[PDB]
């Protein structure tokens, strides 16, 4: 947050869209939601606003909503050769 | 999950295109790769401009 | 079955709180004076002496001022005024 | 630290209705017993009802005065507490204060004193 | 999934009347308890309202500021509920938002904080 934050929106946050998230899948359709039988297209429309918001990178919201460095790492074990881990047996030296 | 390469290259001088030397050799492996995908066919190419 | 290290405790209860004086509920009187463990061992034991022990005789006077609520294998002794105030309580009863 | 709000007085005749409202803030009330108390001026304060933490009628207790006209109500779901107060009588005309301590039940004699709130009129004439 | 509507809002004279519209989709808003809320810029957001669902009197509840001139109704059958507000006051302006979630029944104060509408602008003023 003390590096990041200085706001910026360009790592805006998707609020709406088709339905849930399902596994391994990519959010990158910046489609606006159709919530009416009328068609989205013409810009904004009455029950059908665009996904994208201010998602508070303002100086005033220090303590909160202010960016945190998170990721997540996916593990496999014992299932390809182990590219990043130990050694294999190779007796005594000394 | 895995793939072993062996392979060897000798020189025949005549080549007599009708059978292959007999002659005992052993293909030491040269590469391993770690790629779990599923082969059933196999296709090859040429150099031809 | 064969135990060993039986201890034995005695204390007076109205006999509404026997059901809260297990872990899980605080009673009338197991709110400041009598507790269990998360999991008490051993077995309830109770018989009825109100015919006998009423006669009225305030010497087993239940505590109800207190600091806090109880913490596990802890005695109530301790008989301080409760301070919920800024002024000391010092100089007996006060506001 | 724990904050309340008293709302729902207001100018009623003799024989009607209200409810009391003692917004909680800052804490939760669910562990804790809560103390309706009343003072008319001139007077003392004096209690109306208590309830504890439990919630049990057993451990609901309120004034004699009060005795089956007032009724005492907690909603530890949502950390407030409610005065049912009906059949109105002009000996009823005064600030209603709810009090909180750290004590989990109540007794006929022991009110929660620690934490109270500003308080609301409650008059009861023409 | 639930996705909330508000509309209504507006300029209005103070002393005058507007009805706001909560519209929701993708779920049904009929068996969930319904709240209204309003925050002013530099102030936090505070409830308004909240209606249940049996939907009764005694389950609708108002906050002090707009106890006898705010009224709340929902029609189960176009999935919506109204803010029918009256005699307003300029300290009545603020960006109105309504919410629900999976509670069923409301008190004066905690509302629902689960899913939120984009919210209305109601201005109080000249």
């Given at each position: ?10 790592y805006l946050y998707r609020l709406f869209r088709k339905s849930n998230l399902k596994p391994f899948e990519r959010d990158i359709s910046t489609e606006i939601y159709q919530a009416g039988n009328k068609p989205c297209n013409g810009v904004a429309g009455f029950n059908c606003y665009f996904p994208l918001k201010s998602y508070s990178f303002r100086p005033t919201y220090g303590v909160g909503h202010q960016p945190y460095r ?25 | ?49 | ?95 | ?126």
């Open positions: 947050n003390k590096l990041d934050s200085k706001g910026n929106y360009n998170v990721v997540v790492l996916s593990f496999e074990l014992l299932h390809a050769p182990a590219t990043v881990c130990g050694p294999k047996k190779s007796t005594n030296l000394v | 999950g895995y793939f072993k390469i062996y392979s060897k290259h000798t020189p025949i001088i005549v080549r007599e295109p009708e059978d292959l030397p007999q002659g005992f050799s052993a293909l030491e492996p040269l590469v391993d790769l770690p790629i779990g995908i599923n082969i059933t066919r196999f296709q090859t190419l040429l150099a031809l401009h | 079955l064969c135990f060993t290290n039986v201890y034995a405790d005695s204390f007076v209860i109205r006999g509404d709180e026997v059901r809260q004086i297990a872990p899980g509920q605080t009673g009338n009187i197991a709110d400041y004076n009598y507790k269990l463990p998360d999991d008490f061992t051993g077995c309830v034991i109770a018989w009825n002496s109100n015919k006998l022990d009423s006669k009225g005789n305030y010497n087993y006077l239940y505590r109800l001022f207190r600091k806090s609520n109880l913490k596990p294998f802890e005695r109530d002794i301790s008989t301080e005024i409760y301070q919920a105030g800024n002024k000391p309580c010092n100089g007996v009863a006060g506001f | 630290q724990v904050q309340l709000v008293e709302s729902g007085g207001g100018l009623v005749q003799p024989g009607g209705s209200l409810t009391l409202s003692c917004v909680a803030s800052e804490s939760s009330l669910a562990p804790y017993r809560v103390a309706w108390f009343r003072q008319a001026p001139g007077k003392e304060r004096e209690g109306v009802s208590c309830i504890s933490r439990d919630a049990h009628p057993t451990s609901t207790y309120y004034t004699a005065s009060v005795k089956g006209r007032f009724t005492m109500s907690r909603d530890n779901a949502k950390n407030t507490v409610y005065l049912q107060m009906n059949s109105l009588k002009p000996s009823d005309t005064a600030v209603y204060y709810c009090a909180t301590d750290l004590g989990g039940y109540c007794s006929d004699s022991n009110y929660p004193r620690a934490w109270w709130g500003q308080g609301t009129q409650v008059t009861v004439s023409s």
